[PDB]
């Protein structure tokens, strides 16, 4: 491990996944759970197997029903269902402290992630997810469809944005699934993370895969 | 005119447009006023006339220009700019007691046009106005593009979709601009209006061009 190594503090940027990595809960499956469409949606996932369906349709569909009112995502935020995965709040601090711009990247919703941000004392400007839309009524209107993460494989389209513009050079992506990982070729280094989720197909092909956000404290100190 | 005008007592269902027919000022220009686009929006609508480009196109621009937030549109119905015309309330109130159907077909936003519908006591479902989308953070995000009132000749779409639906014998349209008039053929009959706004087009060209419900309420109160 010494290899890491402050491998990490040789970085100017460290982009984090929120769902399943920055936090134990997913961000979409929760919205549905608070909508009485809980097992209705969790039943929508088994067939993407095939994935036919691409990411935009996929989400435009599972979302095409939830029909998350503004209210409802408000009740969600109010209930604070999101629970951070245990050494993030402090890990993000030890980073931005040493003078590193922490970022958050999700296929989830800016409504939720933003709140997640404040609790990591992460800037608001440093967040990237789908922007949910509502009618005056507060009914589900869809969602921003130009946002980098509304299309398949747009997770990296952003990580190479953050560089195109602020010119970081040497940024890390902490993520749990192969979408987070596939972003490494566009981004400098990928640290897998299973928490909560082991997702074998990353724990097998990925270099540098931690079990928990604590494993990286002892080495971080020394 | 041949007076007393069986026009109205025979009637099954009458419907009027919202913007300076049943109300004093227009929602778009008034909304644009609290955004600083007043002069700019005002000048676009005026050029929008008898062969002007469709509705759907030009109201994408105007709104793209204004860019109204859930905070701006909600506080408007605070300043409640919408002013009912003199003889609108109890003209419709009159006809509503007799068991007829009254409707609001307007190329405005129900976000606003429904505050009007309320107390004229018209249902909420008897209002056809395109909706305005909004982000969770309350910012402009387009408008429902699937609504009849969102494109040109839209008014005659909801009307002809109103007879097949509820099945009426005497549907009467009442508007101020030729637009609201282009729908007469689908509807049984049309009555103009120049109380707030003038525009010859319709003044000298239709049957029973009433100016001001006051000036037709007299023979109506008959
Ligand atoms: N891309 C997701 C992460 P998220 O659902 O936060 O977008 C994964 O592959 O696990
Ligand atoms: N299209 C509007 C009518 P409304 O504002 O009711 O949509 C006009 O005649 O100028």
What is the rounded distance in angstroms from the CA atom of residue B15 to the CA atom of residue A219? 74
Selected catalytic residue, list B12, B19, B144, B204: B19
The DSSP symbol for B89 reads H
What is the rounded distance in angstroms from the CA atom of residue A48 to the CA atom of residue B98? 58
- A51 lies in the same domain as A68: yes
- A138 lies in the same domain as A204: no
Number of domains forming the structure of chain A: 2
For the CA of A197, the closest atom of ligand 1 is: 10
Domain range for residue B52?
27-77+132-143
Instruction: Look at residues A216, A217, A175, A215 and name the one whose alpha carbon lies nearest to residue A197.
Output: A175
Option in A109, A110, A141 nearest B133 (CB):
A141
Option in A132, A135, A136 nearest B136 (CB):
A132
Torsions phi, psi for A218 (to 5 deg)? -55, -45
Q: In what order do the strands lie in the sheet with A13-17?
A: A127-130, A101-109, A13-17, A171-175, A189-193, A209-210
Residue A192: CB within 6 Å of ligand 1? Answer: no
SS3 assignment, position B66: helix
Residue at a domain's end among A143, A172, A193: A143
Residue A94 C-alpha, separation from nearest chain B C-alpha, in angstroms: 30
Cis peptide before A5 (omega within 30 of 0): yes
> Residues B10, B11, B12, B13: what is their CA dihedral angle, to the nearest 10 degrees?
180
Looking at the CA of A155, name the nearest ligand: 1
- Catalytic site residue B19? yes
What is the rounded distance in angstroms from the CA atom of residue B207 to the CA atom of residue A164? 65
Sorted by sequence, the CB contacts under 8 Å of residue A33 that are 6+ apart come out as A81
Whole-angstrom distance between the N-terminal and C-terminal Cα of chain A?
Answer: 12
Residues A171 and A191: beta-carbon distance below 8 Å? no
Residues A134 and A69: beta-carbon distance below 8 Å? yes
Residue B16 C-alpha, separation from nearest chain A C-alpha, in angstroms: 23
- A138 lies in the same domain as A151: no
- A89 lies in the same domain as A119: yes
Tokens describing residue B5: 């005008």
CA of B149 relative to ligand 2 center, distance in Å: 10
Residue B59: CB within 6 Å of ligand 2? Answer: no
For the CA of A155, the closest atom of ligand 1 is: 1
- B152 lies in the same domain as B198: yes
What is the rounded distance in angstroms from the CA atom of residue A16 to the CA atom of residue A176? 10
Instruction: Look at residues A90, A95, A86 and name the one whose alpha carbon lies nearest to residue A12.
Output: A95
Residues A123 and A100: beta-carbon distance below 8 Å? no
Whole-angstrom distance between the N-terminal and C-terminal Cα of chain B?
Answer: 16
Q: Experimental method for this entry?
A: X-ray
- A58 lies in the same domain as A161: no
Looking at the CA of A158, name the nearest ligand: 1
Tokens describing residue A145: 């469809």
What is the rounded distance in angstroms from the CA atom of residue A148 to the CA atom of residue A182? 15
What is the rounded distance in angstroms from the CA atom of residue B67 to the CA atom of residue B36? 10
Beta bridge partners of A102: A14
SS3 labels along chain A? CCCCCCCCCCCCEEEEECECCCECCCCCHHHHHCCCCHHHHCCCCCCECECCCCHHHHHHHHHHHHCCCHHHHHHHHHHCCCCECCCHHHHHHHHHHCCCEEEEEEEEEHHHHHHHHHHHCCCCCCEEEECEEEECCCCEEEECCCCHHHCCCCHHHHHHHHHHHHCCCCEEEEECCHHHHCCCCCCCEEEEECCCCCCHHHHCCCCCEECCCCCCCHHHHC
- B136 lies in the same domain as B113: no
- B137 lies in the same domain as B160: no
CATH number at residue B136: 1.10.150.210
- B41 lies in the same domain as B114: no
Cα-Cα-Cα-Cα dihedral sign, residues A201, A204, A207, A209: positive
Option in B73, B74, B141 nearest A144 (CB):
B141
CATH number at residue A124: 3.40.50.1000
Torsions phi, psi for A19 (to 5 deg)? -60, 120
Residues B5 and B36: beta-carbon distance below 8 Å? no
SS3 assignment, position B67: coil
Instruction: Look at residues B15, B17, B18 and name the one whose alpha carbon lies nearest to residue B188.
Output: B15
Tokens describing residue B151: 């494109």
- A62 lies in the same domain as A11: no
Q: Kindly determine whether residue B144 and residue A136, on different chains, have CB atoms separated by under 8 Å.
A: no
- B39 lies in the same domain as B120: no
What is the rounded distance in angstroms from the CA atom of residue A34 to the CA atom of residue B23? 41
- Catalytic site residue B17? yes
List the binding residues of A: 17-19, 49-50, 106-108, 155, 176, 179
What is the rounded distance in angstroms from the CA atom of residue A190 to the CA atom of residue A202? 10
What is the rounded distance in angstroms from the CA atom of residue A4 to the CA atom of residue B190? 79
Tokens describing residue A211: 């079990």
List the binding residues of A for phosphate: 50, 179
Residue B68: CB within 6 Å of ligand 2? Answer: no
Q: Kindly determine whether residue A131 and residue B136, on different chains, have CB atoms separated by under 8 Å.
A: yes
Residue at a domain's end among A143, A170, A186: A143
β-bridge pairing A209-210 and B133-135: unpaired
- B68 lies in the same domain as B87: no
Q: Kindly determine whether residue A133 and residue B111, on different chains, have CB atoms separated by under 8 Å.
A: no
β-bridge pairing B13-16 and B101-109: parallel
Beta bridge partners of B84: B23
The DSSP symbol for B52 reads P
């Amino acid at each position: 491990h010494s290899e890491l190594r402050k491998l990490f503090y040789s970085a100017d940027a460290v982009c984090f996944d929120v769902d399943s990595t920055v936090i134990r809960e997913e961000g979409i499956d929760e919205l549905a759970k608070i909508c009485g469409v809980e097992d209705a949606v969790s039943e929508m996932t088994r067939r993407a197997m095939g994935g036919a369906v691409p990411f935009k349709a996929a989400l435009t569909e599972r979302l095409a029903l939830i029909q998350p009112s503004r209210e409802q995502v408000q009740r969600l935020i109010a209930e604070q269902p999101p629970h951070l995965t245990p050494g993030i709040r402090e890990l993000v601090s030890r980073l931005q402290e040493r003078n590193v711009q922490v970022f958050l990247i999700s296929g989830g919703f800016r409504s939720i992630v933003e709140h997640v941000a404040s609790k990591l004392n992460i800037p608001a400007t440093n967040v990237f997810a789908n922007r949910l839309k509502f009618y005056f009524n507060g009914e589900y209107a869809g969602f921003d469809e130009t946002q980098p993460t509304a299309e398949s494989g747009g997770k990296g389209k952003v990580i190479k944005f953050l560089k195109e513009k602020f010119h970081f050079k040497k940024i890390i992506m902490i993520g749990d699934g192969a979408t987070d990982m596939e972003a490494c070729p566009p981004a400098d280094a990928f640290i897998g993370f299973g928490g909560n989720v082991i997702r074998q197909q990353v724990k097998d092909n990925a270099k540098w895969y931690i079990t928990d956000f604590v494993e990286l404290l002892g080495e971080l100190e020394e």
